[PDB]
Amino acid sequence: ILLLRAGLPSHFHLQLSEIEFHEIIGSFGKVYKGRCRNKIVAIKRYRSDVDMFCREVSILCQLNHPCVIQFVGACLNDPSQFAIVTQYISGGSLFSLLHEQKRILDLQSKLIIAVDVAKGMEYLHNLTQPIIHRDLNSHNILLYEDGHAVVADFGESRFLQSGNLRWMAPEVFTQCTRYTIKADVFSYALCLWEILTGEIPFAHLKPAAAAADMAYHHIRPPIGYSIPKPISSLLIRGWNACPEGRPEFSEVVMKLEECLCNI
Ligand SMILES: CNS(=O)(=O)c1cccc(Nc2cc(Nc3ccc(C(F)(F)F)cc3)ncn2)c1
Numbered sequence: 001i002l003l004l005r006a007g008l009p010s011h012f013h014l015q016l017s018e019i020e021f022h023e024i025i026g027s028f029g030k031v032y033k034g035r036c037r038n039k040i041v042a043i044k045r046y047r048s049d050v051d052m053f054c055r056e057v058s059i060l061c062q063l064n065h066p067c068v069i070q071f072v073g074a075c076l077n078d079p080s081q082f083a084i085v086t087q088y089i090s091g092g093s094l095f096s097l098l099h100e101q102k103r104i105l106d107l108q109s110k111l112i113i114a115v116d117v118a119k120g121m122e123y124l125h126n127l128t129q130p131i132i133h134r135d136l137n138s139h140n141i142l143l144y145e146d147g148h149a150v151v152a153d154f155g156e157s158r159f160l161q162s163g164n165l166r167w168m169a170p171e172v173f174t175q176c177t178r179y180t181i182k183a184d185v186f187s188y189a190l191c192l193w194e195i196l197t198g199e200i201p202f203a204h205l206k207p208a209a210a211a212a213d214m215a216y217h218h219i220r221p222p223i224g225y226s227i228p229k230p231i232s233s234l235l236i237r238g239w240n241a242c243p244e245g246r247p248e249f250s251e252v253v254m255k256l257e258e259c260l261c262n263i
Pocket residue numbers: 025026031042043044069084085086087088089090091092093096142152153154155
């Protein structure tokens with residue numbers, strides 16, 4: 001908390017009294033719609049707690065990309081006041097569009113979303129010190145009214161680091177490896193499938209059952225023949241159990257922009 005005050009540039013320093021809280025939008029603590037320095041803003045307020053908050057702010061205050069949620073400031077005074085402030089995106093979450101409002105989108109709109117998400121993630125992964133989002137899902141892809149998207153919520157994000165295996169169980173071999181930026185590409189891939197089908201992955205199963213089936217029984221969602229080839233390719237590679245075999249986001253971007261040229 002003291003080291004963070006020094007490193008975090010002083011213009012990101014906010015006092016709780018400068019934030020006006022209006023409505024709850026998500027409910028770890030709570031996220032409010034509100035107002036701060038004449039901006040409409042979303043505010044994440046909190047309930048190891050400190051370290052977590054400190055990581056998050058350090059991650060956020062580095063970010064500047066039009067497909068990544070824009071950081072406004074945080075409150076540091078004390079742990080009772082800990083809060084993060086970002087821009088507010090009026091068009092909502094991708095999850096809401098697809099599954100609550102059940103809005104039907106055409107292929108161009110879908111790909112635009114997929115590309116902007118991929119562009120935000122390419123940015124995160126190619127910083128001098130790369131960042132893993134680690135919680136990428138349709139709840140954290142938010143939408144401008146014009147249809148473009150940004151990646152939000154770095155609550156689980158981390159900076160990337162820089163026995164005898166022949167008899168090890170698969171889960172133990174995987175516990176020992178340590179995850180990379182590629183964990184994000186797998187998440188992305190489910191997100192991309194979610195966008196095209198309009199369905200929550202394994203909707204009929206609970207989160208933990210879905211995770212189990214994907215990790216142990218090796219199941220992935222059904223890829224219908226109606227899914228275009230370049231895309232099902234990204235899907236198939238993107239959710240490979242072997243992380244090393246998932247594409248880099250720069251490529252994901254390259255293929256989807258290529259699809260927009262034919263949409
Ligand atoms: C503090 N920023 S963050 O990136 O850490 C973060 C973490 C968790 C959730 C958010 N949510 C949002 C939501 C948002 N827009 C929004 C528009 C409409 C609705 C409506 F449909 F319910 F009304 C709801 C929301 N803009 C920004 N962050 C952010």
